[PDB]
Design a protein that fits this description.
The structure holds two protein chains of two kinds. By secondary structure, chain A is α+β, with helices and mostly antiparallel strands. Chain A has helices at about 40-45, 90-105, 140-155, 170-175; strands at about 5-15, 30-35, 60-65, 80-85, 120-125, 130-135, 165-170, 175-179. Bound molecules: ligand MGO. Ligand MGO binds near residues 25, 72 and 124 of chain A. Chain A: It is found in: Cytoplasm, P-body; Cytoplasm; Cytoplasm, Stress granule; Nucleus.
Chain lengths: ~180, ~140
Amino acid sequence: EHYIKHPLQNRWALWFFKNDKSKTWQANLRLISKFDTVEDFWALYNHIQLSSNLMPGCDYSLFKDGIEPMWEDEKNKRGGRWLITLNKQQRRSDLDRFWLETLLCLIGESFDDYSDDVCGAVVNVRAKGDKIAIWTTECENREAVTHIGRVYKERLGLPPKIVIGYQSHADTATNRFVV
Amino acid sequence: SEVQLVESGGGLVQPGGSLRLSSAISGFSISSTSIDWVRQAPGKGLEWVARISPSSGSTSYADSVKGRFTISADTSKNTVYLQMNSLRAEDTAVYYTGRVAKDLNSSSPSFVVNTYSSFGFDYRGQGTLVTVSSG
Ligand SMILES: C[n+]1cn([C@@H]2O[C@H](COP(=O)(O)OP(=O)(O)OP(=O)(O)O)[C@@H](O)[C@H]2O)c2cc(N)[nH]c(=O)c21
């Protein structure tokens, strides 16, 4: 009404995936909220369960407005992901901190001009090990992909010896880079 | 009430002058959070100025203002203040109050502003312009 919000550079949508074995993967995927301001990002993040508190087999996906969080999207089909794989102990210590850091790298456009290659990020909550990934639009764009990977690893504070991998969605559905 | 942060008290002063800034906050309690003064000058990054936790009265300051600036609070009026003594040209900026997001409140305000700048505040006012000039 009176309060003036702070526009984000991009418009965003948060998706939720509920594991129901009877349904298709696409049917289990739901858009839960759209936002495009700093205030609306924090209001959403404060009004949903932390990744660490999700039921096993569930996902959150944050994608630029108009990009669906699936391989088949025009903006994802030629692309790939920087993948962080967590062990079972890291669910309590690192999952939420790493996911929030990933969300802030996205809405804060933290890869400068290379942020234009970012489509979104996905957290997979899994018994066998949690996964966080930043999805980029073109697995051939080695300049953008290598920069995003280096800065992402810096922002997460991962030790040098924890090597993270970039996989194309084409390869997942059937590492192109590491840092 | 709707959340508002209304900063006021800015103006034009000559070097050595003083101003007292106010931020009248509505819709959340300053007794349940820290509040930061931050400032934005042309051609510069967002700069953290000072933090107060009104519940405890705990305060901290940027090296650039320590001894000249005093952050304070009136919990009953849900208002925070910045007393700015012996202002210099380099203090010219828009001054804002922000609430850092609860999920980032374990980080130092210097870390939050350096890493997340504006993105680390779940609310921030439109601020008050402070201009220190003799020429
Ligand atoms: C990201 N994703 C997942 N899936 C389906 O879901 C399956 C599991 O993928 P995902 O949830 O990312 O990973 P999991 O840790 O559950 O399993 P894993 O294969 O990595 O061991 C995958 O093999 C596909 O059948 C998809 C099916 C699509 N048509 N498009 C997707 O983008 C897509």
